[PDB]
Design a protein around this ligand. Structure first.
Ligand SMILES: Nc1ncnc2c1ncn2[C@@H]1O[C@H](COP(=O)(O)OP(=O)(O)OC[C@H]2O[C@H](O)[C@H](O)[C@@H]2O)[C@@H](O)[C@H]1O
Ligand SMILES: Nc1cc(Cl)c(S(N)(=O)=O)cc1S(N)(=O)=O
Ligand SMILES: [Cl-]
Ligand SMILES: [Zn+2]
Length: 282
């Protein structure tokens, strides 16, 4: 924990100028239109505009620690609202343009946004989620589960079990959940487009999954203000605020970003809603 490798922290931000930013989000739209199977990979960068500081940005948890400063939260995890980017990802799944969502975020915001859990891999856990050791039944709580590191929460399974409920927050030494990692790897490998949003891609294996898309001629788009570990491997790197990128993209795709009704859990994805017809491309 103390010596744990926190990676490259506080690298300078890159800002694509407006003309170039506009061009690259139109190119992103084209890649989304052309793709049979789109997988999104999300990290701390997608929750910064809700007041949750990232890890390795200029004011990241780890960056600030490295300079002897403190991170600053503008929300609690319970009062955090899903961003435009979160709500855009809900809509893209609803209209069938998102096959799978792989997240490193423990903030519970994808679940609470109404994103279907059967299309979500939560690689590092979910702070609102506790799991029964005996029957592996998961409980999505309305409050943060008070422990980390897969500890006993003090609550017992209510399954028609009295099993010990434990948090789902990995500590440094913990293996990733095999179900989430298995499904994330399968999605990434079979995707012909992987789009990274607000991740520096420094954590193995989470950060390596988008590269798996590149096998058998898949395309990789990295959306990030800072450089990322796999920048060289990207077909497209967009240096801009993920909210500006996702709003411009939804506008290109002719989709509205849906209203957040407040914290809501959806276990299973629906058949796709209607979507606009595809533009002519070539
Ligand atoms: N609004 C924004 N728009 C675009 N990029 C942004 C924005 N805000 C931040 N960024 C970028 O978002 C990126 C966030 O990168 P990192 O902070 O490493 O977060 P991770 O998800 O990859 O951390 C992985 C794990 O590491 C931890 O130990 C935990 O275990 C994590 O789950 C930066 O490069 C920012 O430039
Ligand atoms: N950015 C961030 C910072 C912290 Cl400190 C935590 S944690 N360890 O308190 O869950 C979680 C996140 S996020 N939004 O990536 O889930
Ligand atoms: Cl909190
Ligand atoms: Zn149980």
């Amino acid at each position: 924990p103390f010596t744990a490798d926190k990676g490259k922290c506080g690298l300078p931000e890159i800002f694509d100028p407006p003309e170039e930013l506009e061009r690259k989000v139109w190119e992103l739209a084209r890649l989304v239109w052309q793709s049979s199977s789109v997988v999104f990979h999300t990290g701390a960068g997608i929750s910064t505009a809700s007041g949750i500081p990232d890890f390795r940005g200029p004011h990241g948890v780890w960056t600030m620690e490295e300079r002897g400063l403190a991170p600053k939260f503008d929300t609690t995890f319970e009062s955090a609202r899903p961003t435009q980017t979160h709500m855009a990802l809900v809509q893209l799944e609803r209209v069938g343009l998102l096959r799978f969502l792989v997240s490193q975020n423990v903030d519970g915001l994808h679940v609470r946004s109404g994103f279907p859990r059967d299309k979500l891999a939560e690689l590092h856990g979910n702070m609102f989620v506790e799991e029964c050791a005996k029957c592996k039944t998961q409980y999505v709580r309305d409050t943060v589960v008070g422990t980390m590191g897969l500890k006993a929460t003090g609550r017992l399974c209510t399954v028609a079990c009295r099993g010990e409920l434990r948090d789902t927050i990995l500590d440094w030494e913990d293996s990733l959940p095999d179900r989430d990692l298995a499904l994330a790897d399968e999605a990434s490998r079979n995707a012909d487009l992987s789009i990274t949003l607000g991740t520096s891609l420094q954590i193995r294996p989470s950060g390596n999954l988008p590269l798996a898309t590149k096998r058998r001629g898949g395309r990789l788009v990295i959306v990030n203000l800072q450089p990322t570990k796999h920048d060289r491997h990207a077909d497209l790197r967009i240096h801009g605020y993920v909210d500006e990128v996702m709003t411009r993209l939804m506008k290109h795709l002719g989709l509205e970003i849906p209203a957040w009704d407040g914290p809501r859990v959806l276990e299973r994805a629906l058949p796709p809603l209607p979507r606009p017809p595809t533009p002519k491309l070539e």
